[PDB]
Amino acid sequence: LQFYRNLGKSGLRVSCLGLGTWVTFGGQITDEMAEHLMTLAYDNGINLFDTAEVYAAGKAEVVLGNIIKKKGWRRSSLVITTKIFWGGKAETERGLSRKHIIEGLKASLERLQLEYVDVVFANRPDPNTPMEETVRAMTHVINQGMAMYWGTSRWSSMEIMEAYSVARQFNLIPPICEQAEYHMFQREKVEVQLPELFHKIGVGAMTWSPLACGIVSGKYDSGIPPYSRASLKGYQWLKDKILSEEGRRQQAKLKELQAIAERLGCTLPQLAIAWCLRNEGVSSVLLGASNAEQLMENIGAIQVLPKLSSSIVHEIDSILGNKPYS
Amino acid sequence: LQFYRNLGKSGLRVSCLGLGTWVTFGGQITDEMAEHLMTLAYDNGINLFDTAEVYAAGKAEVVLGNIIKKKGWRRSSLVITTKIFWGGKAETERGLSRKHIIEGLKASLERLQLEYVDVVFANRPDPNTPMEETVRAMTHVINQGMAMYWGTSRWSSMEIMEAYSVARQFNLIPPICEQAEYHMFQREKVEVQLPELFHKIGVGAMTWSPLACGIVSGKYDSGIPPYSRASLKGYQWLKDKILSEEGRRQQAKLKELQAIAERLGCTLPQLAIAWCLRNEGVSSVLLGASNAEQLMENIGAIQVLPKLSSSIVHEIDSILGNKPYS
Amino acid sequence: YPESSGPARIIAIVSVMVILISIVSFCLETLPIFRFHTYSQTDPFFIVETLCIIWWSFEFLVTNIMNIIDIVAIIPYYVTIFSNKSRVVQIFRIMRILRIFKLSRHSKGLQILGQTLKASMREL
Amino acid sequence: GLLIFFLFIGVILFSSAVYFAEADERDSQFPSIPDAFWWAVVSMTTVGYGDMVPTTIGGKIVGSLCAIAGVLTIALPVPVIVSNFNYFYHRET
Amino acid sequence: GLLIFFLFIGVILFSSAVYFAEADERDSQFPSIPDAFWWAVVSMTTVGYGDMVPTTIGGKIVGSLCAIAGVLTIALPVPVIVSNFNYFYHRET
Ligand SMILES: NC(=O)c1ccc[n+]([C@@H]2O[C@H](COP(=O)([O-])OP(=O)(O)OC[C@H]3O[C@@H](n4cnc5c(N)ncnc54)[C@H](OP(=O)(O)O)[C@@H]3O)[C@@H](O)[C@H]2O)c1
Ligand SMILES: NC(=O)c1ccc[n+]([C@@H]2O[C@H](COP(=O)([O-])OP(=O)(O)OC[C@H]3O[C@@H](n4cnc5c(N)ncnc54)[C@H](OP(=O)(O)O)[C@@H]3O)[C@@H](O)[C@H]2O)c1
């Protein structure tokens, strides 16, 4: 019902749906399409756009930056987020050391043609760096005005709490969000681990791959369609996943879920996405889309949200048979 | 076996071998040679380069800076370190006062044609300045983005711990490394004093003069070769050291070590250097080289490292007869 | 002799684009959006290029200044083609530009400037 | 026509030289040849904006000539056009 | 008079082109046409301050011509005035 929500407990208001750029921008789709996708989204009230240095060797950031400059949107109306970790082949070009966080964010900013991002993310945890160093770097780039807030991605709740306590120990800035994978076939962390952090230290969740790369859409119910992500060069791993025995077992369940969708009056993707937004602990879902049709459809997930009754949810849990042990 | 290791416990990854610029760059060798040395090293995976304001009245920094700009290497793939202390004849141009640390690092940066160094070092301790002032200056230049980390050089472990506790007291940044001399005829500090600091507060060692200025190479087994460092104008002190009674006593032992080398299948320099890397407490060894041959040979030290068995080490200790009292 | 009658005349237009586009391509190479066997060096900027490289060497046989405008318009090419399987030859990629001079064979205004120069050496 | 043709020549010609003369630079203000074009025109016509200049020596040599050649180039077809106005102006006078 | 009239023409003309060529820009140094005027004059007269230049391609094309047209424009009424001095100078000599 509420289209805008706070990222965790920070004062930053993001749209419950955001558009990502992985695989697509600079890669699978044309820049014309990219611009169309972004305009469509922006005009529909989506203010959150996620990217990363690693995406397309940096091309994604360039394209996203290009569009923002061309459309001439007000920077204050946007919320750009970017992730740092893999910034090159050199030893010193990856990880969360002070050296890379600074050099990496500075480089991404250059590609984005922006003075700063609203939230910078540690793309994944780094065991080779002390937490204090990392929190100091994030805090540094924020005081330097290169970022407004910082978050973690793929961190255990233990590491998130470590960062938080380290921050309190040295009077630094705590992270305000965690970017966790979350969809019907991947629900352990967002439903068990993260909730406590939300109520304890205000850390919120910004989940990715709501459709499991398109698996949960239902487009694979009978083989690998042409031009689908699974068919792209470089995504054989996705193809394997879909054709595997578990891949089959999964598809068999989407068939069961379709009925749920029909009852709710929506489409499977709309349900899968609205599903992700049923818990308060989730601030936003980062959508993926390779064409305008997909995006225009997916945003409809907002209308489904009010119908996800306890009954409907329980029913879904039964069909999936994988509700995480509380 | 591991070519890259963390500097102390920081998140900064340096190659276990680095190339220095003392005596050579801007001084004994031509810039053509300097460029050749650096390219050779860089191409071989060495990412660490040490220099100082004091070297060649600043010329070394200029040459190093020139090469980096000409080769156009990615700054993020390099780790430049520089040392500060002796920056001029004027009273206020030396020491570790806030005034000199800032002015000195800023000047070195200008000569280096770099926006910053990865690690700035206090070339030696300064009894005329309170520790708090020094730690505040180092922390300042780091927040100002002129350096990524800071270290100490030629400091007792007591002073290193003072800097560390002072840092914790005022919420400043602790040093992450100590640049200590270390070779077969100089082993007290690195083997006794520094290890505790490594396990207690993560401070690592970046040792210099692994060949004792070329003494441990064996090139002086029968006199002072021409064009050797000992023969340079301004290095009579080195010449004296080599011809002294102790100088003789030393050479007599290298003869004994040669056999060890032959057994290991390597050359004396390769052994002397690999020797330095046998302890975890040592993050990296800064090599010196006046020509391509020397550098290409010395890097072979990596292959020897795996052969330094307890037996071999004990044997060496016996020959040197100077293992520091635990 | 281009404008010999019309037929052997339009054989000139097929030399125009083979230049007024040979140039167009030589510039798109330097483009950032298009850039040991790679440090030096199949590829379009090598495709439509030779698509005329031999097209030149054709009339190159079918002396004088106006003619040297086609010799050098192909010399630097086969020069680096010739060794070290693994800054020389640099003086030859930058000499590919001279190919623009091949225009003088159809630009009277241009060739006019030609003599206007030699007839002014003492001035320059 | 002649004026433009010449320029076009001097331009494509000089833009290329200044490039392969800056190519090796951690500052080269010339992303590529098509980029230098702007510089070429601005230099030859003696405007001298400054929003693009050679930093190396080769480039500054190249540029020197580019300035000189600029004058000579323009100062050829122009005089004619000058006369054509010289006439027509007084004719209808 | 003619000199000024022409300029005025080339100016109002070129200031407008460079505008509708930069209009769509997150950097356009031309708030509006009346603004470009300054640029127009400075370019046509080959001064080239730099305190205002085209950043897009369209603008740099427009500007190219503006430089060329600048020469032609001025180089028409001027020659006359040149002669008028050529005379008077030696007459009273
Ligand atoms: N934090 C991290 O480490 C991390 C990791 C991964 C992703 N992310 C972020 O999360 C974003 C979303 O991830 P995602 O792309 O995997 O999301 P997703 O929602 O799981 O998948 C989107 C993809 O599925 C297909 N699809 C979407 N809607 C569809 C529809 N209605 N009908 C049919 N097919 C449809 C499209 O692929 P095809 O049309 O090509 O088949 C589209 O590219 C990323 O762009 C990125 O910003 C973050
Ligand atoms: N923290 C400090 O205060 C401090 C102090 C001193 C040095 N350092 C650093 O440590 C670096 C290394 O010091 P260093 O130069 O004394 O190192 P070293 O390894 O003790 O000596 C290197 C020198 O020995 C000779 N040599 C090296 N390899 C050889 C080989 N294979 N065969 C024969 N001769 C060989 C060369 O001198 P010749 O060929 O000229 O005889 C070369 O210049 C310096 O460049 C500097 O960056 C730091």
Q: H/E/C letters for each residue in chain C? A: CHHHCCCCCCCCHHHHHHHHCHHHHHHHHCCHHHCCCCCCCCCHHHHHHHHHHHHHHHHCCCCCHHHHHHHCCCHHHHHHHCCCCCCCCCCCCCCCHHHHHHHHHCCHHHHHHHHHHHCCCCCC
Residue B292: enclosing H or E segment and its boundaries? Answer: helix B292-298
A180 CA: nearest ligand 1 atom: 1
B272 Cβ closer than 6 Å to some ligand 2 atom: no
Resolution in A: 2.9
List Cβ neighbours of B182 (8 Å cut-off, separation of 6 or more): B189, B190, B205, B207, B208, B209, B210, B276, B282, B285
Q: Are the C-beta atoms of A114 and A7 separated by less than 8 Å?
A: no
Please report the domains of chain B, with CATH numbers, ordered by start residue. Answer: 1-326 (3.20.20.100)
Catalytic residue annotation of A: 55
- Give the Å distances, CA to CA, from A130 to A120, A134, A136, A163, D58: 18, 7, 10, 10, 49
Residue D26 forms contact with B (CB below 8 Å): yes
Q: How far apart (Å, rounded) are the C-alpha atoms in residues A185 and A254? A: 11
Q: Which structural domain range is residue D7 located in?
A: 1-93
**Yes or no, beta carbons of D34 and C97 under 8 Å apart:** no
* Interface chains of chain E (3 or more CB pairs under 8 Å): A, D
Question: Mind telling me how many Å the CA of D54 is from chain C's nearest CA?
Answer: 17
Which tokens go with E19?
Answer: 């505008």
Q: Are the C-beta atoms of A205 and A194 separated by less than 8 Å?
A: yes
Q: Are the C-beta atoms of C86 and C36 separated by less than 8 Å?
A: yes
Largest CA distance in chain B: 55
B289 Cβ closer than 6 Å to some ligand 2 atom: yes
Whether C contacts B, i.e. 3 or more CB pairs less than 8 A apart, is no
Question: Mind telling me how many Å the CA of B193 is from chain A's nearest CA?
Answer: 23
Q: How far is the CA of B290 from the centre of ligand 2 (A)?
A: 8
Which tokens go with A82?
Answer: 């970017």
Strand pairing category for B147-153 and B117-122: parallel
**Residues of chain A contacting E26 with CB distance shorter than 8 Å:** 69-70, 72
A291 CA: nearest ligand 1 atom: 39
Which tokens go with A141?
Answer: 């780039």
Q: Which of B12, B80, B119 to mutate to test the interface with A (most CBs of A within 10 A)?
A: B12
B164 catalytic? Reply is no
List Cβ neighbours of B304 (8 Å cut-off, separation of 6 or more): B264, B266, B270, B271, B273, B274
| Residue numbering of the annotated binding site of A | 21-22, 28, 50, 123, 153-154, 179, 208-213, 219, 227, 229, 288, 290, 294, 297-298
**Residues of chain A contacting B202 with CB distance shorter than 8 Å:** 130
A293 CA: nearest ligand 1 atom: 31
Q: 């660490």: which residue's tokens?
A: B48
Cα-only R_g, chain E: 16
Residue E23: CB atoms within 10 A of its CB come to 13
Length of chain D: 93
Q: How far apart (Å, rounded) are the C-alpha atoms in residues B290 and A70? A: 54
Q: Are the C-beta atoms of A36 and A69 separated by less than 8 Å?
A: no
The number of folded domains in chain D is 1
**Residues of chain D contacting C27 with CB distance shorter than 8 Å:** 12, 15-16, 32-34
Q: Which CATH number is E92's domain given?
A: 1.10.287.70
CA-closest residue to ligand 1 atom 11: A20
B265: left (phi over 0), alpha (psi -120 to 50) or beta: left
Q: Please provide residue B163's backbone torsions phi and psi, each rounded to the nearest 5 degrees.
A: -55, -45
Whether A contacts B, i.e. 3 or more CB pairs less than 8 A apart, is yes
**Residues of chain D contacting B72 with CB distance shorter than 8 Å:** 24, 26
State how far Cα B257 lies from the chain centre: 23
B20 Cβ closer than 6 Å to some ligand 2 atom: yes
A80: left (phi over 0), alpha (psi -120 to 50) or beta: beta
Using an 8 Å CB-CB cutoff, list residues of chain A that contact chain E: 69-70, 72
